[PDB]
Amino acid sequence: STGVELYLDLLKRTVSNFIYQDATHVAGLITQAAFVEEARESGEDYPTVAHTMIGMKRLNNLQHCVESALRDGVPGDVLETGVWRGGACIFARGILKAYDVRDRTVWVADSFQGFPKITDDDHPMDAEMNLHQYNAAVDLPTSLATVQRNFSRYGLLDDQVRFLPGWFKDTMPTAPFERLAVLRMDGDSYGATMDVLTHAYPRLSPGGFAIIDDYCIPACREAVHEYRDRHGISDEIVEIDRQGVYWRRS
Amino acid sequence: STGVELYLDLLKRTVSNFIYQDATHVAGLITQAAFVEEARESGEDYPTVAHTMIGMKRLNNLQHCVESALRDGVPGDVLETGVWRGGACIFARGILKAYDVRDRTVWVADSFQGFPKITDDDHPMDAEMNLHQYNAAVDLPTSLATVQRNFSRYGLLDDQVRFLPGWFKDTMPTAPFERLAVLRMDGDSYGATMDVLTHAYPRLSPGGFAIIDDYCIPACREAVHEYRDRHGISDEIVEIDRQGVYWRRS
Ligand SMILES: CC[C@H]1OC(=O)/C=C/[C@H](C)[C@@H](O[C@@H]2O[C@H](C)C[C@H](N(C)C)[C@H]2O)[C@@H](C)C[C@@H](C)C(=O)/C=C/C=C/[C@@H]1CO[C@@H]1O[C@H](C)[C@@H](O)[C@@H](O)[C@H]1O
Numbered sequence: 001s002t003g004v005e006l007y008l009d010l011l012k013r014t015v016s017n018f019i020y021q022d023a024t025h026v027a028g029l030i031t032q033a034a035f036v037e038e039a040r041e042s043g044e045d046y047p048t049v050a051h052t053m054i055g056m057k058r059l060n061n062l063q064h065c066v067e068s069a070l071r072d073g074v075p076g077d078v079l080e081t082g083v084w085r086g087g088a089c090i091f092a093r094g095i096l097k098a099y100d101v102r103d104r105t106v107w108v109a110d111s112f113q114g115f116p117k118i119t120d121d122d123h124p125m126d127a128e129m130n131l132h133q134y135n136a137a138v139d140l141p142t143s144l145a146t147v148q149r150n151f152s153r154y155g156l157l158d159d160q161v162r163f164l165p166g167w168f169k170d171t172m173p174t175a176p177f178e179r180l181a182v183l184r185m186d187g188d189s190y191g192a193t194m195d196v197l198t199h200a201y202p203r204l205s206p207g208g209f210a211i212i213d214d215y216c217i218p219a220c221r222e223a224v225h226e227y228r229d230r231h232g233i234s235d236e237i238v239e240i241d242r243q244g245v246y247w248r249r250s
Numbered sequence: 251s252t253g254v255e256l257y258l259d260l261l262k263r264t265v266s267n268f269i270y271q272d273a274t275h276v277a278g279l280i281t282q283a284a285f286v287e288e289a290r291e292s293g294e295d296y297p298t299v300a301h302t303m304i305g306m307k308r309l310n311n312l313q314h315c316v317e318s319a320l321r322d323g324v325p326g327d328v329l330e331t332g333v334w335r336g337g338a339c340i341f342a343r344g345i346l347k348a349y350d351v352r353d354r355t356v357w358v359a360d361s362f363q364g365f366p367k368i369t370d371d372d373h374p375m376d377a378e379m380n381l382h383q384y385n386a387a388v389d390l391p392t393s394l395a396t397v398q399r400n401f402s403r404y405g406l407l408d409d410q411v412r413f414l415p416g417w418f419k420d421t422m423p424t425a426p427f428e429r430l431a432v433l434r435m436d437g438d439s440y441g442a443t444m445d446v447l448t449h450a451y452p453r454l455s456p457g458g459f460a461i462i463d464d465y466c467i468p469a470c471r472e473a474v475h476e477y478r479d480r481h482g483i484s485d486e487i488v489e490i491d492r493q494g495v496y497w498r499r500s
Pocket residue numbers: 027028029053129131134138186187188213214216217218243
């Protein structure tokens with residue numbers, strides 16, 4: 001109903017392409033290419049064209065996290081670790097824009113090359129899963145230049161969008177943000193989750209939100225529990241849909 | 251900037267599909283399928299997937315006309331005659347939604363079958379052009395149910411959108427609107443333009459806008475001048491882009 005609500009509603013439907021309803025890649029448990037409403041609603045398919053694969057329920061979750069941070073005066077930026085085509089970060093920048101927020105940044109972190117090749121240093125669950133095998137099949141490698149172009153299409157490429165290109169184990173320890181209000185983790189593997197919890201989570205403000213996109217994946221979940229056990233973190237884990245969870249840092 | 255401005259901006263870029271940049275059908279003077287930014291900007295291509303073909307300059311014109319009418323208190327509804335997939339009507343409905351206007355309607359008038367088969371009742375310029383020949387090539391015939399579906403994808407199918415299915419010569423004389431603030435004519439032919447000027451233009455409020463999408467088409471232009479000459483209409487014809495013009499009713 002308000003201009004703000006209308007904009008953010010359309011922005012979600014647009015970055016997930018409920019508007020034009022692109023086919024999905026046939027991969028994983030998806031056995032047909034046709035668009036299925038319930039799969040895009042829950043972020044369960046692999047869009048051929050859409051700018052995000054997280055789906056409406058996880059987009060609604062990101063909106064709730066950012067809005068709650070803003071309402072409650074939780075200081076800091078938004079970081080997403082694993083962005084693909086950039087749709088969820090585009091949406092994040094859009095939320096700031098809708099509220100005319102000029103003092104927070106959206107940090108966009110990725111290899112911009114898809115999943116890394118497995119080495120002997122990987123966690124054995126990451127090695128067995130070998131996410132790198134799927135890069136082309138779902139068009140995962142998405143260059144920095146492409147992501148930036150995608151932001152421009154929505155008129156949201158500006159100096160409150162900053163990019164952190166590279167492997168998370170390399171980029172996160174010295175990433176130049178001071179404080180985060182929302183940390184959205186979407187790198188799927190034990191390694192990526194643990195890199196980001198280790199190196200970015202300490203900068204998450206009290207009251208801020210930690211979102212684990214891929215908690216359904218056993219390697220991801222293992223890292224979340226190892227990390228929480230190590231640091232004494234007991235904040236409730238709340239489910240979003242069939243894949244994602246989040247907690248709010250107390 | 252404001253929520254409203256951001257919504258209407260995004261809605262334009264969405265119905266014209268500047269977001270995902272679909273190919274064009276190859277037809278008329280368009281010889282290549284690739285998306286070309288300047289052609290989508292000026293509404294000169296035949297989108298394979300986008301909901302309107304009128305392009306950003308003619309979307310912007312529609313916005314200007316509807317907002318001036320609202321601002322100046324010109325009474326009445328919005329009618330578009332020739333709606334194809336419905337994008338320009340979806341956009342009009344979205345303008346009213348953005349300003350929380352609850353007392354005006356968007357009327358959506360089309361054969362829902364593309365251009366009419368030519369008979370010996372048609373104006374000789376319409377018969378020579380034979381627009382009907384291009385129906386399949388630019389995917390023109392678009393059913394009422396498809397247009398309703400498209401509105402629903404934006405959240406804009408409600409009781410302030412009303413449909414007028416049929417040939418304009420049949421639907422216009424008794425169409426149930428009482429007054430119009432904007433009359434957008436997009437039927438291309440002498441016949442479709444003369445049908446709508448004859449039977450709907452008298453209901454256009456003073457201060458209201460008459461938009462001729464296809465003024466570059468000689469048959470359309472002939473109808474426009476015959477009608478203005480007959481009724482003594484001398485209101486300045488203002489050019490929008492390389493196709494459309496409008497005037498404001500004195
Ligand atoms: C297509 C790429 C995809 O791969 C699949 O979905 C693979 C599904 C396998 C076929 C499953 O195996 C089956 O289930 C049982 C084991 C009995 C089955 N049985 C026949 C033995 C066995 O066949 C998995 C359950 C295996 C486990 C290890 C797992 O969870 C692996 C996850 C893989 C995730 C990537 C999607 O990338 C990310 O997904 C995130 C969730 C998204 O948010 C998003 O970030 C996205 O980019």
